[PDB]
Design a protein around this nucleic acid. Sequence first.
RNA 1: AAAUGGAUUUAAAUCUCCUUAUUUAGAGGAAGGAGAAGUCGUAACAAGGUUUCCGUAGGUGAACCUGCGGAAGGAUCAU
RNA 2: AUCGAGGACUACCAAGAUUAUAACGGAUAACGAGGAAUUGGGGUUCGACAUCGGAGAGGGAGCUUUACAGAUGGCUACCACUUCUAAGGAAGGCAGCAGGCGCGUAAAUUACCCACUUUCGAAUUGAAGAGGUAGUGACGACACAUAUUGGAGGGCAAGUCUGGUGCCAGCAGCCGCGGUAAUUCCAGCUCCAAUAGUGUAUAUUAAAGUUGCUGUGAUUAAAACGCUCGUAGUUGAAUUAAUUACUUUGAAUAAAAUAAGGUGUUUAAAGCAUGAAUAUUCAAGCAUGGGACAAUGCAUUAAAAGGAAAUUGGGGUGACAGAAAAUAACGGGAGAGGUGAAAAUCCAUGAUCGCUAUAAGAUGCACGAGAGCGAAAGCAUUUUCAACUGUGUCCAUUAAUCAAGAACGAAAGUUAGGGGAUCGAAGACGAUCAGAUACCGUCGUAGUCCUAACUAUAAACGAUGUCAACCAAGGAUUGGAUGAAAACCUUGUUCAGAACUUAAAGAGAAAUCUUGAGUUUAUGGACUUCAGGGGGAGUAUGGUCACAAGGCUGAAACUUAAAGGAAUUGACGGAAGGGCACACCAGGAGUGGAGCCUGCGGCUUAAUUUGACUC
RNA 3: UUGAAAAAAU
RNA 4: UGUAAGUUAGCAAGAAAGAGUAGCUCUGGUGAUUAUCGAAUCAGAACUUUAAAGGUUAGGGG
Lengths: 129, 95, 106, 76
Amino acid sequence: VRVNVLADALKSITNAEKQGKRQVMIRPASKVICEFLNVMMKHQYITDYTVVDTHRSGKIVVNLNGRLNKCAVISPRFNVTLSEFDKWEANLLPSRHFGALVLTTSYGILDNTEARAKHTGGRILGFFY
Amino acid sequence: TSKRRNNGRSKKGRGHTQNVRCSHCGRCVPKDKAIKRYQIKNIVEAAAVRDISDNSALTKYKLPKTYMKLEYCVSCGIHGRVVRVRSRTDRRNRL
Amino acid sequence: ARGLHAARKMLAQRRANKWADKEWKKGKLVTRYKCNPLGTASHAKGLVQEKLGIETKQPNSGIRKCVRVRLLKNGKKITAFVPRDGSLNYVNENDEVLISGFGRRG
Amino acid sequence: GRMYNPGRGISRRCIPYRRSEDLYFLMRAVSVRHLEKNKKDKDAKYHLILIESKIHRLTRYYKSAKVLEASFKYDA
RNA sequence: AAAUGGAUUUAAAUCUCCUUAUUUAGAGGAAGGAGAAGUCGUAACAAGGUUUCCGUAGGUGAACCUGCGGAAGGAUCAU
RNA sequence: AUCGAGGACUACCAAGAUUAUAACGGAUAACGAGGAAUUGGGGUUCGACAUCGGAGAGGGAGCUUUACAGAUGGCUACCACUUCUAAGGAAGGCAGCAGGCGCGUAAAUUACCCACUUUCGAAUUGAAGAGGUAGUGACGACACAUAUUGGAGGGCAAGUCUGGUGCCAGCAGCCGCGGUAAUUCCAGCUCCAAUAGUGUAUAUUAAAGUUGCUGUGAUUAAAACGCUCGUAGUUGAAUUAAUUACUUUGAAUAAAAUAAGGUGUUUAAAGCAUGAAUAUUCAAGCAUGGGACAAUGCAUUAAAAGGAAAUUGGGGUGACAGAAAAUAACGGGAGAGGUGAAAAUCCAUGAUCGCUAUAAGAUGCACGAGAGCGAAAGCAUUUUCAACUGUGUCCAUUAAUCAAGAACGAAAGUUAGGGGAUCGAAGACGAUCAGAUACCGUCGUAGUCCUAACUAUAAACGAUGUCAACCAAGGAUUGGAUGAAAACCUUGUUCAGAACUUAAAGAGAAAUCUUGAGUUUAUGGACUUCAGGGGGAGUAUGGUCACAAGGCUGAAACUUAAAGGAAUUGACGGAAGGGCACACCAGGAGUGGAGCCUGCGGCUUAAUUUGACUC
RNA sequence: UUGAAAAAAU
RNA sequence: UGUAAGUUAGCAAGAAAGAGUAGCUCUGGUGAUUAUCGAAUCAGAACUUUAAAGGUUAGGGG
Ligand SMILES: NC[C@@H]1O[C@H](O[C@H]2[C@@H](O)[C@H](O[C@@H]3[C@@H](O)[C@H](N)C[C@H](N)[C@H]3O[C@H]3O[C@H](CO)[C@@H](O)[C@H](O)[C@H]3N)O[C@@H]2CO)[C@H](N)[C@@H](O)[C@@H]1O
């Protein structure tokens, strides 16, 4: 069954950009799914999205412009200590200036670029090139 | 690996089909794996069809035809020249 | 078995799946101390009993001079390869001969 | 998809976009236990096992909802 | 307060039943492996000259043969 | 009772404690920690031995002194040892420092002194095989005079040097080199790597993405349970403007050591001669800022999650047909079965053949399909359950996968009845063959069929586990719903199902796959099982189930450089298709038969010289 | 219709 | 209280092996009728002795 709603959402976006689609639909829209797209919009990997109200966790339409390379979820969210960031950057990211991790912290959803500044850790949701 | 995509037979959604007996050697072969040919032949061959009409007690008698369905297996289906070995890219022909 | 709380299945799987290698398993079975004539020893001292010559395998030809040596710690019989050319003469009957493995491990 | 048969139907009711027993109906198990007259009906014996587990699945859940007292037990 | 008698405690040592590890058992019996040119056959790889193989049962110096069902990894994707 | 809490022990009372989150038991060549070897991150192996804690003084057992001993360089008894003896007796515990025997591949002097550090004492002094110096010391570490080891075919640096040996000696960790011209052997000359170093054998680590959380594979190389149900376990849709986990900080946290801050032991290995704040603490624990994600149970929905309340269904159970053979009567008088050819066999008691009747056994053609149903096995004559679709119906997370456990599970096989027509393991004849104990022909017990009870294996195959999201183009099919065309036929939209064609795209080692074998070095959706070179071998032993055959679980000793997968070329086929040749058909001449010329083999000889041996 | 075999290594 | 190999799964089995048993004085359990009445049976506790089936009957075992 649907174990991780975020996992099925991200693979839909990754597959859509590999086919050159202009906008894709994700039927469920949790809080983290919308929050994850907000992290990818500050980096300008997507232009904008929308949240159709269907009374059953309505769909999301993501507007993308050939910029997202690989957005993926991470299997059960590992506890990322602040000192452990360097372990994951060197593996999950292509280069020290390109990739962007996504983490969940008590102060809200944050990316690796800003969560280091906020001086906090927590679980990890995924990444995107 | 797989010389054929459908493994020679022609069954997809069923796990068993009743056996039939080959018409030449009498070898138990499945219904779909068998080679089915339908033969229509007049009992009187063309070399003798006009011989009957010269001396026939009837007036407008039309000679009937024999209706037999022959099923062969691969062992004597190929040996009987019913089917032959085809090219690798010519195997997919199904007409 | 990727789940965060499933750290017992993964560990138990590796404990089960580690026994199938031919190399490390030799390091946990009690056979080195039992069936290996050398045991865990580098060298084995023995006594000469018989002089024997083993012919080579199919592609090659010739007779390889060898000696059947009986150990002093286990008493087992092992065939030993006399090292050099014409060196079978140097060895004698009932003398201390050192036996130490071969190139291939064990 | 269905719990037991590998069929995947999606027929549903669609409650419109505006705002302006099940345990009892499964005790099918009684109707099958037809079994006495046809003891060799091995296909009905298998299908009865599926229905028996279906009831033993709502029992385990209804108890945690306190709908049924924890002394509930299904016997024919 | 010394020898010594007796009754308890902790009990060494030993005899009889009760499991783990190491050994003697002859040639003994039944297996397996290795070693250029040793016998008998043609079983397999071409349609290998009876298509091959799987499960099961029987037979037979030997591969193996035959019965029931299955498979194409068949020699047919086909009338 | 003990200094002290307590089943520590005693008397009474109740039956309670652990257990799949691995209880109880078994092995270690197991003293634990600080740490050591090696690491890109992650990890693997070792740790008796510097320091801390634990235990022991040949083996337990019992006690003395004392503040602390179950003390053993204290005592006693027993078991096993050793020493002197006047033959009556006596003491001893080197797992303390040296040293002796044995054990082994394996390990130093039967030296001197309390000077450095420290401890004990009747206390400034006396004692210490603790401690220090000296001695052996190629385990190792640092600076450094000017000499060996192994090799010179590839991995790997180096000889297209000369003598011998002639698949024999031999070298070779691996591939191999040697059967009279050795780049590899035994030797003579030369230089290649390292240098107080260098070969050898064993073990640890990296390579090994060959143990895989980071990080593997499961169609064909090894490997998806035959399928389904199911407990433990793991994983569980969205939504809200009291603990625990998570996360940020601190406190305390043995030294040695890890990386070092400083410091010219001449550098360095060293050493700490200001003592780096030195950071260390994985696992746990204490206090604290935050609650996004999370686990625990006392109020929103209505998930292309699930479950419950007009059709389709060779889905499961129970209660018409003539073929082959037999029997009966009738016609006919000589063959009939069978094979490439025959024979054994049946027939003058009338066979084979033809019409008509009778009874049981079995079967279910044509319709019959890359069509349908079923979890799998499977399901084919007519006259209880599963699924799809329709649905402004109900519940609200009831969900997915699943060790243990259980149901169903082709054919053969077992047991007892009924039946026993056709075919037919064993078997008997007849052929073929060198033999044939087989293929071919004839006969025939078990079986093939039904019932009841077992067995639980198959190429149980799509060699492809189950659930879930995305996924290019096209024809066609089965069952529904909705429109037009007025149950069937043509067409549009849409849901479910078995499949198919193309791909210049994606994957793969390739064949191939596309309703994945795609979304994977740009590696993580959730779960279960299996595999680690080939043999030994699914064998032995052990356990368990079965009336039995057998099934499920199931190694090692030893042996070996390959075994195996997909495609290319060639060759081969008692495989096919297309052509050709005095190859053959229709023939002529012949050779082979006779005498003789000549060549060859053989015999002979002093020599009867030798090359050639199917075209 | 019948039709079996070709000593080990270079 | 405990009881092996083997096995036709029924048996082997009273397998083998070990503990208790006396006398006297007591206590409790097992019922009928509404406190009385009746039965031999089992268990437990003190105290004593010449330490208890053995006068008779009465398996040797592997
Ligand atoms: N390896 C065990 C088994 O050996 C079986 O067969 C074994 C023997 O029967 C077989 O023997 C072969 C023989 O078949 C062949 N026709 C003649 C050959 N000379 C024999 O060879 C055998 O024996 C000779 C005797 O000197 C040895 O020199 C030679 O090394 C050895 N292989 O060789 C095998 C090993 O000795 C089967 N191959 C198989 O079941 C299995 O491999």
